Amino acid sequence: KVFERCELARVLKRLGMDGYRGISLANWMCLAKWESGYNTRATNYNAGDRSTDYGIFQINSRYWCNDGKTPGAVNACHLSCSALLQDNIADAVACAKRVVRDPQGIRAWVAWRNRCQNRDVRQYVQGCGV
Ligand code: NA
C-alpha cells in the first residue's frame, strides 16, 4: 500500500507515535517519506552485507526481524520480516518503536540524519489535522 501523506500522518498519531521517545510525528513522516515513499511493500537488498530493509520504515533484517537468510542476524522485534510488508502497519509501528528504544534513537536510520535532522520538517504534517 502507498499511503497518501495526511492519511499516514493521522494513522501514526492514532498509533501513538507523536512524541514517542521524544520523536515528533513530523520526524516519523520525514523518515517514512525518504525510506520508502510511504510504500509498505518496499524492499531493498543490501548486497554488501546480505541484509534486506523491509517496509514503510525500511527496517533491517540483521537486527530487527527474521528472514532466515541474513547471516549472524537477530530478531529484536520478534517478527518475521514478512510482517513488515502488510498493508496494516501496526506491526511495522511496534517494531519502529523498538528500534528507537536503543540509545541512537531516530539516528539509527542514516536517511534521517541526511534528509531530516536540523531541517524544517513542518511540511510533512501541515494541513493534515494532527
Ligand atoms: Na534478523
Please, are residues 58 and 42 in contact by the beta-carbon 8 Å criterion?
Answer: yes
The structure's method of determination equals: X-ray
- CA 75 to CA 16: how far, in whole Å? 23
Rounded to the nearest whole angstrom, what is the distance from the C-alpha of residue 129 to the centroid of ligand 1?
36
Annotated active-site residue 35? The verdict is yes
Annotated active-site residue 53? The verdict is yes
Mapped onto helix, strand or coil, the DSSP state of residue 27 is helix
With a CB cutoff of 8 Å and minimum separation 6, the contacts of 92 are 40, 55, 56, 57, 59, 83, 84, 86
43 CB-contact burial (10 Å; exposed 0-12 / middle 13-18 / buried 19+): middle
Domain boundaries, the chain: 1-130
Q: How many CB atoms neighbour CB 23 within 10 A? A: 18
H helix runs in the chain, sequence order: 5-14, 25-36, 90-100, 110-115
96 CB-contact burial (10 Å; exposed 0-12 / middle 13-18 / buried 19+): buried
Rounded to the nearest whole angstrom, what is the distance from the C-alpha of residue 100 to the centroid of ligand 1?
17
Place of cell 513542518: 122
Give the angle subtended at the CA of 60 by the CAs of 33 and 38, to the nearest 5°: 20
Q: What does this entry list as its resolution, in Å?
A: 1.8
Rounded to the nearest whole angstrom, what is the distance from the C-alpha of residue 34 to the centroid of ligand 1?
22
Rounded to the nearest whole angstrom, what is the distance from the C-alpha of residue 59 to the centroid of ligand 1?
10
Mapped onto helix, strand or coil, the DSSP state of residue 45 is strand
Q: Fold for domain 1-130?
A: Lysozyme (1.10.530)
